[PDB]
């Protein structure tokens, strides 16, 4: 801890609320952030000063509850807020939302009592630059491009193998990518969180990311706390050059969280009482996440849907926090393919026409033409007897069967899960093998040959298997 | 009556006053002041006065100005503040200033009142009742005490 040697403070003047109506050592005031750690009955109390207000009388607040104590008090002032053991040692080891050894002592590796306050870089510092990204997902990293060291809006419903593909991310972000792969969550179902410890064994790769969890009953400060200490962590990983890429749970928890926040203030909050600066906190947020100099500061962007809000100042912000748009197909899950999700609505923003230029303006943009091809070939040509439809529309239905089957491909996840090995994929074998093949080449490649089969050597050499 | 404004007062009373030792000296001056507002014409005339200067004027003036200059220029301070409106707040808070400073006391239970200054519990207390002598408790003597244990008793008559 900091100081708070000396017990400081004094009484809690009017005993109401976690924010301090409190006599501190009245001359004593820290930075409002700069913590004040008392004894809370038995417990050691603490409040970062909610208010900076004189007479040692300022709001100083906490995620807990005050009943039972005397208005009288004295409260040691933890000269630092924000400084809590932090670094990359935590990886895999269970941190409380306190970072506390969440598990049987989860002992997320005790590290620098490290200020949460890690934040935006200089124009050049984390990359004045652009850094693209792909891990070579079988049908997917091929499908969409990405920018390194960042976060992109994730829209999809269910059956993701998000834990599977996370194992592909273990098989990538841990494996097929080196950069330190961290993640965190909050507000889950209890034994279902424990079942994400089960899954934590499913990937088993849990060691890449400390276990730190909210369990939504956590109070609003408790609920909203963990992030900036997360920056005391990427203050290892990205800062550790092993690019910080950490998976991001919950926006609705965060959106509504900042709502409950500015509400508690009683302040003129954001509209509908939300956190007024929660968006500015997004400026601090993406301000944190950049493919960096240090190491790419990257984050998995998926939102607790702020009610999946309409026009969603969140999605409004999460659009442009989405380099690639996203959809997941229960229909491709109804197609059930090793590609089981919605390629529709899922691609990088600038990939096809420029920025790959033709590379995706041909392979991928022309590929999108093929999306029209099985789109109205499968769809239109499905409307009535496709006999009218040129067999190209039925070779857009071998784009479907054949090619879309090729999309179905083993997964580095499915390796880490079903054993279906999968890969960091080569979109050359897409941009050519799947683009030429899926389009004109080896159209005799069976669906099955292509189905559940990786790049056009797995789909088309599985067409040697046919 | 906020007495909190007068808290800053009695603060400055032990503080500047006791610093000046006016805690006693303007216990005297102060005494004469509560005498001034105590004047009911001086209450009847208390506030019509827009100029608080007029107030401290006719106040020290009227009453005879036994206030200190700490209390005359302070008379500018509170009079100007108009917080001078409430005299006794920091008067019992100054009584609490010197007295709280000096605090030792008692309270008679089941007795006519005691208030024997006891720096410690039972110190002058058990020394007083032991010292009784008095031992009569006259006010609260019997019906109060015997109705105390018997109060608990009727509390058992809760059984009816």
């Amino acid at each position: 801890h900091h100081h708070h040697h000396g017990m400081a403070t004094g009484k809690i003047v009017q005993v109401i609320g976690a924010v301090v109506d409190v006599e501190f050592p009245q001359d004593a005031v820290p930075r409002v952030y700069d913590a004040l750690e008392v004894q809370n009955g038995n417990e050691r109390l603490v409040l970062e000063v909610q208010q900076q207000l004189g007479g040692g009388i300022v709001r100083t607040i906490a995620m807990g509850s005050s009943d039972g104590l005397r208005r009288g008090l004295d409260v040691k002032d933890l000269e630092h807020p924000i400084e809590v053991p932090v670094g990359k040692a935590t990886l895999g080891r269970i941190m409380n939302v306190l970072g506390e050894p969440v598990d049987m002592k989860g002992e997320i590796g005790e590290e620098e009592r490290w200020a949460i306050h890690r934040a935006a870089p200089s124009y050049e510092e984390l990359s004045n630059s652009q850094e693209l990204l792909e891990t070579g997902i079988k049908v997917i990293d091929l499908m969409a491009p990405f920018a390194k060291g960042g976060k992109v809006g994730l829209f999809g419903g269910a059956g993701v193998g998000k834990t599977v593909n996370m194992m592909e991310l273990i098989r990538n972000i841990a494996i097929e990518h080196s950069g330190y792969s961290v993640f965190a969550g909050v507000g889950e179902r209890t034994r279902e969180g424990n079942d994400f410890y089960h899954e934590m064994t499913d990937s088993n790769v849990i060691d890449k990311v400390s276990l730190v969890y909210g369990q939504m009953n956590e109070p609003p400060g408790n609920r909203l706390r963990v992030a900036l200490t997360g920056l005391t962590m990427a203050e290892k990983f990205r800062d550790e050059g092993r690019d910080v890429l950490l998976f991001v749970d919950n926006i609705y928890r965060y959106t509504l969280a900042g709502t409950e926040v500015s509400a508690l203030l009683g302040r003129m909050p954001s509209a509908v009482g939300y956190q007024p600066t929660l968006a500015e906190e997004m400026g601090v947020l993406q301000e944190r996440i950049t493919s960096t100099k240090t190491g790419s500061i990257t984050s998995v962007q998926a939102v607790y849907v702020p009610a999946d809000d309409l026009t969603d100042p969140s999605p409004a912000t999460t659009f442009a926090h989405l380099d690639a748009t996203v959809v997941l197909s229960r229909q491709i899950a109804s197609l059930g393919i090793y590609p089981a999700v919605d390629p529709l609505d899922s691609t990088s923003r600038q990939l096809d026409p420029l920025v790959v230029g033709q590379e995706h303006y041909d392979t991928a943009r022309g590929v999108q033409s093929i999306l029209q091809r099985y789109q109205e070939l499968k769809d239109i040509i499905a409307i009535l007897g496709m006999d009218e439809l040129s067999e190209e529309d039925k070779l857009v239905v071998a784009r479907a069967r054949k090619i879309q089957r090729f999309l179905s491909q083993p997964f580095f996840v499915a390796e880490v899960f079903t054993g279906s090995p999968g890969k960091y994929v080569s979109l050359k074998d897409t941009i050519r093998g799947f683009k030429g093949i899926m389009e004109g080449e080896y159209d005799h490649l069976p669906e099955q040959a292509f189905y559940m089969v990786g790049s056009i050597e797995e789909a088309v050499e599985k067409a040697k298997k046919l | 009556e906020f007495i909190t404004v007068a808290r800053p007062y009695a603060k400055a009373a032990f503080d500047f006053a006791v610093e000046h030792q006016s805690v006693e000296r303007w216990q005297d001056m102060l005494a004469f002041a509560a005498e001034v507002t105590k004047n009911e014409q001086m209450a009847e005339l208390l506030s019509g006065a827009l100029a608080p200067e007029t107030l401290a004027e006719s106040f020290i003036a009227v009453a005879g100005e036994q206030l200190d200059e700490n209390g005359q220029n302070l008379i500018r301070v509170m009079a100007e503040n108009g917080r001078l409106n409430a005299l006794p707040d920091v008067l019992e808070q100054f009584i609490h200033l010197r007295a709280v400073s000096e605090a030792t006391a008692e309270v008679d239970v089941i007795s006519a009142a005691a208030l024997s200054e006891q720096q410690l519990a039972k110190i002058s207390a058990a020394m007083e009742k032991r010292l009784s002598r008095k031992v009569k408790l006259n006010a609260k003597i019997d019906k109060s005490v015997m109705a105390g244990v018997i109060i608990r008793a009727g509390d058992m008559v809760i059984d009816g």
């Binding site: - | 404004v5 800053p8 007062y9 200190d68 220029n73 302070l74 500018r76 503040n81 917080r83």
Partner: protein
């Protein structure tokens, strides 16, 4: 409040009589977040911006008698109060005149140029207001959109004001910089003030500052997520002044700014923080009192101006200041009080449909629902004269398309119109990063005017022999420079274009 002292009431025991602390520095009384009750600085000057300890000149506007409340200069929350006052009566001095152009600014100024050593004339206040009603130039001073449909649809000149809304994700942020490419050569120095920007947008943007060019034409504003109402809210109020370098040289001054509302609740949410009345939408008519103040400014100003505006230095230059609103198209929430208010204020206006950006039609916007005060007023014989019949005819191909589906069999009226207007309608779309040439406008002038495109009118040949048109035209039409130089509707050159248009049939 007062009783708080009890120590200076301990003083005041004497020191209600005892006295005399008046100084530019008495203590910051109450420190929370750059709002400090504060002492000394007795009479202090206008909002007197008081050079703060390790911090900017701190401003307190209307004198708070007891302890003047003060404004966060940079960091709001640092410490406890009692600073005395690190104090300056001066407010509003910022490098002025034409000096520093082209080298990028902070919200502070040129300093955030990587150079940062860009010297404007020298410290000036940041305010500005309207050019002389009387002393005003009307500058038709035409302008080239770079997406022709606007330029011909709306010419304009120095002094102008108009409204704009850029659509979500397209096309607001990107907007017109092709015009800026077109305006890389604009020559009336132009800058844009963007509120609260995100950096790398500015970085690769700077890649387009090289690319499109030319950042040196003018330096531009700097505001990010951390922009205080100082930075954020005042930035639009801030940028008012030195363009008089040009403008009150009598020279042409022009600049851009857009989408400031972080001003609105920066300053307004400030008003809450200020405990000051939140107006409608928690922000007062200081919208229209700011537009009153700031937005009443832009004009080409008379010779009578720079006889004064330049003080007879330019001895009657016409102080030319044009500027335009863009309130980026969002939410469909429109009148929006101030926006309605400012709608009332808007001389010209752009209703801009995403839908065609939603349709991805390079031409997104609402067609003449965007309504500019200026328009073909600046347009030339070719432009005004030759280019005339647009928008209504547009409404035709629209309206001509209209009935077709439910009640059908639109004759070659609508076919030969709606489609002709659908064909030409197709010829409209101008992609992002597309500037437009005046000679290139002449393409529509003759072609459409000649109906000449009807030959190639197949969007295949329309575009194609539109390209052969472009090419062997440029071949056949070297003299077009004159034409491009010319304001057109030149009957001689007109016939010349009929001929080179016959070329344009196969060749050009």
């Amino acid at each position: 409040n007062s009783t708080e002292i009890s120590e200076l009431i301990k003083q005041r025991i004497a020191q209600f009589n005892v006295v005399s602390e008046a100084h530019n520095e008495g203590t910051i009384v109450s420190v929370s977040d750059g709002v400090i009750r504060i002492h000394g600085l007795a009479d202090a000057m206008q909002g007197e911006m008081i050079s703060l300890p390790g911090n900017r000149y701190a401003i307190a506007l209307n004198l708070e008698r007891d302890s003047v409340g003060a404004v966060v200069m940079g960091p709001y929350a640092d410490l406890a109060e009692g600073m005395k006052v690190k104090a300056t009566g001066r407010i509003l001095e910022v490098p002025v005149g034409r000096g520093l152009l082209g080298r990028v600014v902070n919200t502070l100024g040129a300093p955030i140029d990587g150079k940062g050593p860009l010297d404007h004339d020298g410290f000036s206040a940041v305010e500005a207001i309207a050019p002389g009603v009387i002393e005003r130039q009307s500058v038709d001073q035409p302008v080239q959109t770079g997406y022709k449909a606007v330029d011909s649809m709306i010419p304009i000149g120095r002094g102008q004001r108009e409204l704009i809304i850029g659509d979500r994700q397209t096309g607001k942020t990107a907007l017109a910089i092709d015009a800026i490419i077109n305006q890389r050569d604009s020559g009336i120095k132009a800058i844009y003030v963007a509120i609260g920007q995100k950096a790398s947008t500015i970085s690769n943007v700077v890649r387009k500052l090289e690319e499109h060019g030319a950042l040196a034409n003018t330096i531009v504003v700097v505001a990010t997520a951390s922009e205080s109402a100082a930075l954020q809210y005042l930035a639009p109020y801030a940028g008012a002044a030195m363009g008089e370098y040009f403008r009150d040289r009598g020279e042409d001054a022009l600049i851009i700014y857009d989408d400031l509302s972080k001003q609105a609740v920066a300053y307004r949410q400030i008003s809450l923080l200020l405990r000051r009345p939140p107006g409608r939408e928690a922000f007062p008519g200081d919208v229209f009192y700011l537009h009153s103040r700031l937005l009443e400014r832009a004009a080409r100003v008379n010779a009578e101006y720079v006889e004064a505006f330049t003080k007879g230095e330019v001895k009657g230059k016409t102080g030319s200041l044009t500027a335009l609103p863009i309130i980026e198209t969002q939410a469909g929430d429109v009148s929006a009080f101030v926006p309605t208010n400012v709608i009332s204020i808007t001389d010209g206006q752009i209703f801009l449909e995403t839908n065609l950006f939603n349709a991805g039609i390079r031409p997104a916007v609402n067609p003449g629902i965007s309504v500019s005060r200026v328009g073909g007023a600046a347009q030339t014989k070719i432009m005004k004269k030759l280019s005339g019949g647009i928008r209504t005819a547009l409404a035709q191909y629209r309206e001509l398309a209209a009935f077709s589906q439910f009640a059908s069999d639109l004759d070659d009226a609508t076919r030969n119109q709606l489609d002709h207007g659908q064909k030409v309608t197709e010829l409209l779309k101008q992609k992002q990063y597309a500037p437009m040439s005046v000679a290139q406008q002449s393409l529509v002038l003759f072609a459409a005017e000649r109906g000449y495109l009807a030959d190639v009118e197949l969007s295949k040949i329309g575009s194609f022999e539109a390209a052969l048109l472009a090419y062997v035209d440029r071949d056949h039409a070297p003299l077009m420079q004159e034409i491009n130089q010319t304001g057109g509707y030149n009957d001689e050159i007109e016939g010349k274009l009929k001929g080179i248009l016959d070329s344009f049939k196969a060749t050009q």
